């Protein structure tokens, strides 16, 4: 019997929690990119460096999309939905994006 107010609180909570995981993963990969840049060789020809940057971009795009959706939800915008409902690229982020997609399909 979830009220509209409960549905809305669930949406905000889940978007916030996913953002925290996304942001934590970016801090991890960024520290890793910085150490790699400092410690590795031939970083002109290191595909790993570009792929990490691309991955970080995917995570940060999602953080922004989720922030804007939270903002719309708080503004009472009808049928606010995250622009991105897939996970980037056992893994908790992937389970939570599936739940996110389901929440915005059923409510």
């Amino acid at each position: 019997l979830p009220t509209v107010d409960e549905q809305r609180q669930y949406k905000v909570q889940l978007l916030l929690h996913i953002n925290s995981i996304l942001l934590a993963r970016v801090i991890q990969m960024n520290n890793s990119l910085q150490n790699n840049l400092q410690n590795n060789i031939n970083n002109s020809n290191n595909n790993n460096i570009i792929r990490i940057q691309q991955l970080i971009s995917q995570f940060l795009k999602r953080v922004h999309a989720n922030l804007q959706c939270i903002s719309q939800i708080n503004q009472g915008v009808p049928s606010a939905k995250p622009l991105i409902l897939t996970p980037p690229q056992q893994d908790i982020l992937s389970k939570l994006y599936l739940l996110l997609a389901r929440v915005f399909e059923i409510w």
Partner: protein, 49 residues
């Protein structure tokens, strides 16, 4: 919009800014975010749906 939710929201906006500007995230916001991670919402009742 609870005080804790609003506290996390500003930590996340600030962290996003700091990230996209290649600035360090001040440590108070990392701790707000780490708190969020360690206290997740009740996904179960969300499943009742």
């Amino acid at each position: 919009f609870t005080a804790e939710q609003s506290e996390l929201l500003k930590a996340q906006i600030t962290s996003l800014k700091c990230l996209v500007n290649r600035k360090p995230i001040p440590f108070e916001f990392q701790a707000v975010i780490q708190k969020s991670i360690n206290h997740p919402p009740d996904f179960k009742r969300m499943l009742l749906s």
